Amino acid sequence: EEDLTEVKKDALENLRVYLCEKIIAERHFDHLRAKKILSREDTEEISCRTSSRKRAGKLLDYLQENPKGLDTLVESIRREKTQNFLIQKITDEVLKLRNIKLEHLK
Amino acid sequence: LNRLREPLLRRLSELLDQAPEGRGWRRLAELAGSSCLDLEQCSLKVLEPEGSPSLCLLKLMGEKGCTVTELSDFLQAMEHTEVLQ
């Protein structure tokens, strides 16, 4: 349902500032490239950047075209178990915005 | 817990999900005394459109073998009497 889509979209895009620091940019787009949501042109466009942070910015802003992308962003982080503490943070964010949508229903 | 029917567990889960309290479901999973996979799988169960973490936690405590009066003692320890009524 598209309500989950819209709350997922704004629940990602409200928190761009924190996520664009503690994420290595290169170490994911082979997994989500296997999900057929991202192409080589994106790989070249991301490599055109020179800063550390703006890679994370345009990569993070290059996922707001399909609703199921965030799962894949979890999944590679689920795959490489080097860091995982971001999960329940963004999860609690999703519960909060879901609660506001739920109270706005009635 | 795990023995009882659908409407009581369903209503209790869908009421415990909507938790504006700071002592929410993560507090209720963290009881007094008696690893990561429980919390992670509940926090991924919430990603579905029709789920609660509360359902995952009630299934977990039913797998613990908790009883309804026992859980009500934990809820009195949780010191929100609006949940008990």
Author numbering:
A (entry chain H): 10 to 115
B (entry chain F): 30 to 63, 70 to 120
Task: Tell me, in the authors' exact words, what the paper reports.
CARD11, B cell lymphoma 10 (BCL10) and mucosa-associated lymphoid tissue lymphoma translocation protein 1 (MALT1) assemble the CARD11-BCL10-MALT1 (CBM) complex that bridges TCR/BCR proximal signaling to the canonical IκB kinase (IKK)/NF-κB and JNK pathway in lymphocytes. Upon assembly, the CBM complex serves as a scaffolding platform that activates downstream signaling events via association of mediators such as ubiquitin ligases (e.g., TRAF6) and protein kinases (e.g., TAK1 and IKKβ). Beyond the scaffolding function, MALT1 is a paracaspase and contributes proteolytic activity to the CBM complex, which is key for optimal lymphocyte activation and differentiation. CARD11 acts as a molecular seed that upon binding induces the assembly of BCL10 filaments in vitro and in cells.
To provide structural information about the interaction of BCL10 with MALT1 we performed cryo-electron microscopy (cryo-EM) of the human BCL10 (full length)-MALT1 (T29-G722) complex. Visual inspection of cryo-EM images of the purified complex, underpinned by 2D classification and examination of the power spectra, revealed that BCL10-MALT1 assembles into flexible helical filaments of ~29 nm in diameter, with an ordered inner core of ~14 nm in diameter and a less defined periphery. Our analysis revealed that BCL10-MALT1 is a left-handed helix with a per subunit rotation of 100.8° and a rise of 5.083 Å, resulting in 3.571 subunits of BCL10-MALT1 per helical turn. This helical arrangement agrees with the one observed for the BCL10 (residue 1–115) filament alone, thus indicating that the overall arrangement of the BCL10 CARD core is largely unaltered within the BCL10-MALT1 complex structure. The 4.9 Å resolution map of the inner filament part enabled us to build a pseudo atomic model of BCL10 residues 10–115 and MALT1 residues (30–121) by flexible fitting of a BCL10 homology model and a related crystal structure of MALT1 DD into the EM density. Whereas type I and type II interactions are interstrand contacts between the helical turns, the type III interface exhibits interactions in the helical-strand direction. The MALT1 DD interacts with BCL10 at the rim of the CARD core filament in a 1:1 stoichiometry. A close-up view of the BCL10-MALT1 interaction site I (BM-I) illustrates that MALT1 binds to the C-terminal part (BCL10 helix α6) of the BCL10 CARD forming a new interface that is distinct from the BCL10 filament interfaces I–III. In BM-I, the two most central interacting residues of MALT1 are V81 and L82 situated in helix α4.
